[PDB]
Design a protein around this ligand. Sequence first.
Ligand SMILES: O=S(=O)(O)c1cccc2cccc(Nc3ccc(Cl)cc3)c12
Ligand SMILES: O=S(=O)(O)c1cccc2cccc(Nc3ccc(Cl)cc3)c12
Length: 290
Amino acid sequence: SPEFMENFQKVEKIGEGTYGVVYKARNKLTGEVVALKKIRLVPSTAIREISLLKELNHPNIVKLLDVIHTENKLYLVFEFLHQDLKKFMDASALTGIPLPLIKSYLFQLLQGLAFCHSHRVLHRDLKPQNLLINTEGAIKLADFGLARAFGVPVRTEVVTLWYRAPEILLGCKYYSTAVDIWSLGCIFAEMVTRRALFPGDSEIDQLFRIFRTLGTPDEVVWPGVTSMPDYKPSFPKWARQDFSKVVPPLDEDGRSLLSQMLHYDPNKRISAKAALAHPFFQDVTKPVPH
Ligand SMILES: O=S(=O)(O)c1cccc2cccc(Nc3ccc(Cl)cc3)c12
Ligand SMILES: O=S(=O)(O)c1cccc2cccc(Nc3ccc(Cl)cc3)c12
């Protein structure tokens, strides 16, 4: 103490992220491998949200070990992890992730989200590449979306659209913790089917792909939807599709949970805390990935 960037030896780039390149590095003093994020350099609400995220200590949130300030630079020192759910799904495309691991990962992500949400922290940008996994079966939240959400002046892609809740796409100013449950519901479906649920290429295309699968919402399904800032009565009217077609492998317990996570109305969408008690998790275990 203090640590300096000279105390770290770069090993390899371990991928990109909302802040560009992440590096595997080695502490020359201790031998510990870590993951380093470089942030090139803030609104008052943004400082406060960063402080809230720094407060969080949880098994399912990637552990921040240190923050090193040098001139224009911030170097975030994290625990070393180097697999993520997107890379794991791609390597498992031939066979699919086994259901006990799907259940375990979904359960843990709900635990991490429940913890964030009770501390007034939202993720806002949940996607499979932001979800880090280790050898012992844990999965962890990372690359929180607060820089673009709170106008942080830091350098920071259609993949982000695929997991965006419909109340965001329709312009809602004061969205809620429910946006994270939507994203996780999409990831749940994607683990099961081995394909992204709503891979749109623009905000309107994302909306139309959602509508084509879940039905065009109306006031009966989603009170207030037709007055949302970007709602247009010219939207096409699609009927809802059966989950036997949308997520063929799921049974009624899985379809029940997924339908509650993808509820149009954010006020009716299941909370993270409540989803942990869903019957789907009756037999949840902690398997190790291969
Ligand atoms: O609070 S920090 O622990 O430094 C911090 C931790 C992680 C990410 C951060 C992203 C943006 C600004 C941060 N803070 C900060 C405060 C003062 C100065 Cl002069 C420069 C930067 C971040
Ligand atoms: O990188 S993260 O994986 O999102 C992350 C994960 C876990 C704890 C974090 C604690 C404080 C800041 C984090 N990140 C961050 C980076 C840049 C900005 Cl401007 C704002 C926030 C944390």
